Every structure is written in structure tokens, then in C-alpha cells.
Design a protein around this ligand. Structure first.
Ligand code: HEM
Ligand code: HEM
Ligand code: HEM
Ligand code: HEM
Lengths: 142, 146, 142, 146
């Protein structure tokens, strides 16, 4: 579970980044698609998978906004994300092995854009937080 | 492994600007803090039980530099790494018993550090090439498990 | 989370096997050690790692008894196993990647000894249950 | 990969008693029930959304048999499998996009089935050899990812 110190660290880095939701989310999504190309089949309906893609921008903002909501309901990530879990499991049919991939590219992007804020302990906190988010999104799969 | 020229160049050019000391220390620091059970494997380093102690530890620093120089060596053998790393693989398996999940924790730390170090120069394409390089390193180090 | 149908299935197969705690646990531990030999360093203090080892028998019974306790407190696996989590994390220093390995050899042994009881749905239930046990044991690691 | 004679013999002897139909059906059934998201990858099979439907599905049966015959082929190429499986690997990556975590789910299902089928004849040593064979198959199928 996230400790109080973890949640402070997550709220801190997210407060610093949430204003760039679209840019951050497009970088993270874009990077998932290019660095882990087995993910591209999920977004094969988009004409452009690049960071400048308007569809990648729109969807990237959705991802970061959903995480912001989780950060604001950090004591119950399960309830915040259970609807999205159903969606990814039943409608989108996303293999849940992919959740850690987007979690990783999110961390990369946070490092890239806020290197002084993303200290080792903040990374730890943010890694626990995205594992919790991923565990939550995986919960309805079986 | 087959490399494109663009991948080749993305890797060697980024590498020409890597401080193996600062990047190697920072990657290993992150491994020890974010995945703190890896601390068991590094008993020789003394007190590495908390973040400030890990980060100021001169043995963590020296060992991070060693890991990054080995990364340098993988780059030099990037067409034949499974082979070049056979002893190193065997060493991590048979002497140290490192679960290979930890190789990807380390890879992730390294990519994170390169992003922090390089900022916008760590473009999606350069990140993709580096993730491929890290995946090759991981695969080479995991090979002498079976 | 485990559904009611999952918990019925777990209690069923465990009711059928719990009487053989020692035999079952020695097979599962023995098999972990031989099939996944990176685990042997954790039990390097034992003179014999074979299924007939008296130390493997004693410890195998402990493992199966701890799982039995979890099966009997199946609505709170976290509270049942938090002490064992601390122990594996702080005292034993077991890398938590190993938990899925013993989970798998437990499933193998259940299949082997109760093939007609270990139907696909029971396997599903028991796989969810041991993932939950593993997630619980991993909880104090960071 | 290097094999002992005892490993070699454990594998080929067990294999001589495997019904590739019953074992292959049962392994695939378990994959589809225990890891039900894998059902996405098998759209051509019709209704595989629940356990009784998966288990009675004649296309699940035929495909399990195909997977197990390919296992047979891996055994025949057990000294050169990375190579023998190149197309099959490439096929699972580039055409199907199977996350390779699913290869080990399948391996686990297969080992579980062999235990159920063989009982006490699936001794710890024979299980160990079969886990090594499965690990080799997994590694071969995961290789053309990078
Ligand atoms: C932190 C993890 C994740 C979060 C927070 C997240 C969030 C979301 C949200 C909020 C939507 C709905 C957007 C809308 O209403 O328009 C969505 C859709 C989607 N997600 Fe995710 N997701 C995650 C992981 C993944 C992963 C790993 C994949 C695939 C590799 C994936 C694939 C999709 C797809 C295909 C859609 C439909 C998007 C579209 O049609 O344009 N998601 N996700
Ligand atoms: C992924 C890339 C990694 C590389 C490239 C790497 C490379 C190296 C190298 C070059 C050495 C020196 C070996 C020698 O003396 O010949 C070494 C030592 C070692 N490595 Fe790694 N390693 C990696 C990951 C890991 C991980 C993840 C762990 C543990 C979690 C680990 C644990 C060790 C230990 C315990 C030593 C001995 C250190 C000592 O002097 O006390 N390594 N490694
Ligand atoms: C389902 C997962 C697991 C359960 C339920 C479990 C349960 C237990 C229990 C109850 C004990 C204490 C026994 C006593 O008081 O004498 C214990 C000790 C131990 N566990 Fe585990 N454990 C699990 C997984 C693992 C794994 C995966 C490893 C290593 C690969 C491990 C290594 C140990 C070791 C080394 C000890 C000390 C045993 C001794 O000193 O003889 N455990 N475990
Ligand atoms: C681990 C061992 C596995 C082996 C040995 C194996 C082998 C095979 C073979 C021989 C074929 C026939 C290919 C051809 O037509 O040339 C095949 C097809 C296929 N495999 Fe696998 N496979 C494995 C795992 C998986 C997993 C885990 C998935 C998905 C979760 C998967 C999905 C498929 C699909 C979708 C096809 C095409 C089936 C169709 O006809 O509709 N395979 N596989």
C-alpha cells in the first residue's frame, strides 16, 4: 500500500505535471507505441501514432486526466478506476500485460520533463502508485 | 539481432555524451531504492537500507560505473551480445542467483535516467532504440539461466 | 477479487487436499527447488532439498498450513498473511519474484494428486487465490 | 542449450505416452479459462467465452492438437529450437501480436496438464526436465520480438 510519504510524493509530482496533461499524455502514449511496438495493434484505428498526431493528443489527455482522478482519490484507486477496468477488459479487450508498459513510459516522461522533482523516492512512490493503478485496471479481467 | 543504421547511430551518438559515472550511479541508486529487495544481492556495499545512504554510498557509485562500462561493452558487441555476455550471464545466474526480472527493473531505471539526463534529446525514436538495446542486454544476461 | 464461486472452488479443492499437508507441501517445495533451481540458495541451509528430506517435509507442512489458514480467512488474505509478508521481506529477504514460482508448483501438485477435482474452473479459482496470496506476501516489500 | 542424457530421455519417454489430442485440448482449454483475455487472440473459434463452451469447442480441440504437434517438433529440434522456430516466433509477434507473457501462461498450463495426466510418473526430475523444455520453447517463441 502507499504510505502517507508515498502519497505526498505522488501528489507533488502530479501537481507539477497535471497542467501539461495533453503534452505529457501524448509523449507517454506515443512512446509506448514506438518503444513497445506490440502495443500498436490497439491503436491501429488511428491514422497517426506519432506524438504530433491529434488523436494521440486527445487520447493522451484522457489517460493523464484519468490518472489525475486517481491521484485525487488516492485512498481508493479501485473505486476510481473500476469502470475503466471493465472497459479495458470487456470492450477494448486490452491484454493486461500491457498496463506495465504504459506505466513505464509515464515514468520515463515524468523523468524527462521534471528531472529534479523525480528523485529516487518520488520514482518509488510513483512506481507503487502506477502498479496500484495497473492492479486496479487488471482486477475485472477474470 | 538486426539493427537499422538509424538505431545504430541513435545509440552510439547518445552514448558519446553519457557520463558513465553520473548515469551509472543514478541508475543503480534507483534500482536499490525503487526495488529495495535488490539490496540483498549487494551485501558487500555496507549500509544501503535507505535512500540518502544509498545515494551517498561510494561503493554504489563505483559499482554503477562498472555496470555502465559493461553497457559500453554491450554496445561494442551489439551484433554478438548473447555471445560476448556468456560469462557475465553465467556469473549472474550461478554465482549470484539474480532473478532475471531484476534485469528489467535495472533496464527501466537506466532508461529513466537517460530521459532525466537528456530531456527532449531523448526523443521517442532515440528512446525506442535504447529500449531495444536494453532488451538485448536483458536477453543476453538472462540466457545462461537455461 | 475472488468471487463466491471462486472461494467455493478453492475451499473445495483445499478440503480434499489439506489432509495431505506434509506430502503435498514437500512435493511443491521439492519441485520448486528442482524445477526452478534459482530458488535453492534460499534453502541452502538444508542438507537435503529432495522430496524425502525431513527438513523439506517439515517446511512443506508449514507452507500448506499457512495456505489453509488463508483459505479459512479467504475474505481477508492480507490480514492473514501480513506477518508472513514482513518475515519474508525483512528477515528472510526472499526476492518476491519467487512467490509465483511456488504458486505454480502448488498448482502442479494439486493437479497431480487431484486431477478430477482440479478442473479448469478450479484451476482458475486456485490461480486467482495464490495470486492474491502472493500479492499479499509482496505487500510489505516497499 | 545443453541437455543431459537423463533430461533427453525424460522428455522423449514421457512424450512417447502423450496423447497430443487430449493433452493439447486440455492445455489450451486451461489457457482460455484461466487467462481469459487470451480469448481475444482466437476470434476465429467462435464462442469461447465460458468454460463449458471452451471445453466442448471442436476448434479449440483441433488447435490444441496443432500446438502439441509443434511441441513434438520442438522436441525433434531440441538442440536447435531458436532456429527451427524462427517463422513461428515471427508469426506470433508480427501477425498476431501475442504478448510473450502468454507463452509462459501456456507453458504453465501444459506442465499442469502433464501432471494431471501422468500423476506420480511426473516425478520432480521429469517435471524439471519438462520445465526446461518449456522454457526453451518459450524463449524460442519470444526471440523474434527483438
Ligand atoms: C495507466 C494505464 C491506463 C489508463 C489510465 C488508461 C485510460 C484510458 C481511458 C480514460 C480511456 C477512455 C478514453 C475516452 O473516453 O475517450 C481509455 C481508452 C483506451 N485504452 Fe487505455 N488506459 C491505460 C492503459 C492502456 C493500455 C496499456 C492500452 C493498450 C496497450 C490501452 C488501450 C486503450 C484503448 C485502445 C482505448 C480506446 C481509445 C480510443 O478508442 O481511441 N489502455 N484508456
Ligand atoms: C542489467 C544489466 C546488468 C549489467 C549490465 C550488470 C553487470 C555487472 C558487471 C559488469 C559486474 C562486475 C562483474 C565482474 O566482476 O566480472 C556485475 C557484478 C554484480 N552484479 Fe550486475 N549487472 C546487471 C544487473 C544486475 C542486477 C539487476 C543485480 C541484482 C539485482 C546484479 C547484481 C550484481 C552483483 C551482486 C554483482 C557483484 C557485485 C559486488 O562486487 O559485490 N546485477 N554486474
Ligand atoms: C505461497 C507462498 C509462500 C508461503 C505460504 C510461505 C510460507 C512460509 C512459512 C509459514 C514460513 C515459516 C515456517 C516456520 O515458522 O518455521 C516460511 C519460511 C520460509 N520461506 Fe516461505 N512461503 C512462501 C513462499 C516462499 C518462497 C517463494 C521462498 C523462496 C523461494 C520462501 C522461502 C522461505 C524460507 C527460506 C523460509 C525460512 C524456512 C526455514 O528456515 O527453514 N518462501 N514460509
Ligand atoms: C507456447 C507455445 C505455443 C506454441 C508452441 C504455439 C504454436 C502455434 C502453431 C504451430 C500455430 C499454427 C501456426 C501456423 O499456422 O503455421 C499457432 C497458431 C496460433 N497461435 Fe500459437 N503457440 C503457442 C502459444 C500461443 C499463445 C500463448 C497464443 C495466444 C495467447 C497463441 C495464439 C495463436 C493464434 C491466434 C494462432 C492462429 C490460430 C488460428 O488459426 O486462428 N499461441 N500457434
Amino acid at each position: 500500500s502507499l504510505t502517507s510519504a508515498d502519497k505526498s510524493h505522488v501528489r507533488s509530482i502530479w501537481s507539477k505535471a497535471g497542467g501539461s496533461a495533453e503534452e505529457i499524455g501524448a509523449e507517454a502514449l506515443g512512446r509506448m507505441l514506438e518503444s513497445f511496438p506490440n502495443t500498436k495493434t490497439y491503436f491501429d484505428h488511428y491514422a497517426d501514432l506519432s506524438v504530433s498526431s491529434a488523436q494521440v493528443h486527445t487520447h493522451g489527455k484522457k489517460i493523464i486526466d484519468a490518472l489525475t482522478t486517481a491521484v485525487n482519490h488516492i485512498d481508493d484507486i479501485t473505486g476510481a478506476l473500476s469502470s475503466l477496468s471493465t472497459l479495458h477488459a470487456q470492450t477494448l479487450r486490452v491484454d493486461p500485460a500491457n498496463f506495465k508498459i504504459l506505466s513505464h513510459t509515464i515514468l520515463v516522461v515524468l523523468a524527462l520533463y521534471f528531472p529534479a522533482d523525480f528523485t529516487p523516492e518520488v520514482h518509488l512512490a510513483c512506481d507503487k502508485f502506477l502498479a496500484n493503478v495497473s492492479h486496479a485496471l487488471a482486477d475485472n479481467y477474470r | 539481432v538486426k539493427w537499422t543504421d538509424s538505431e545504430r547511430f541513435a545509440i552510439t551518438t547518445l552514448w558519446a555524451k553519457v557520463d558513465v559515472e553520473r548515469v551509472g550511479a543514478q541508475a543503480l541508486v534507483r534500482l536499490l531504492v525503487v526495488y529495495p529487495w535488490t539490496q540483498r544481492y549487494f551485501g558487500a556495499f555496507g549500509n544501503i537500507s535507505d535512500a540518502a545512504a544509498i545515494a551517498g554510498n561510494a561503493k554504489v557509485h563505483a559499482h554503477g560505473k562498472t555496470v555502465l562500462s559493461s553497457v559500453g561493452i554491450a554496445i561494442a558487441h551489439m551484433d554478438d551480445l548473447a555471445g560476448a555476455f556468456t560469462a557475465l550471464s553465467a556469473f549472474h545466474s550461478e554465482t549470484l542467483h539474480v532473478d532475471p526480472d531484476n534485469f528489467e527493473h535495472f533496464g527501466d531505471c537506466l532508461s529513466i535516467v537517460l530521459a532525466a539526463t537528456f530531456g527532449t534529446a531523448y526523443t521517442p525514436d532515440v528512446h525506442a532504440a535504447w529500449q531495444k538495446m536494453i532488451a538485448v542486454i536483458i536477453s543476453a544476461l538472462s540466457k545462461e539461466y537455461h
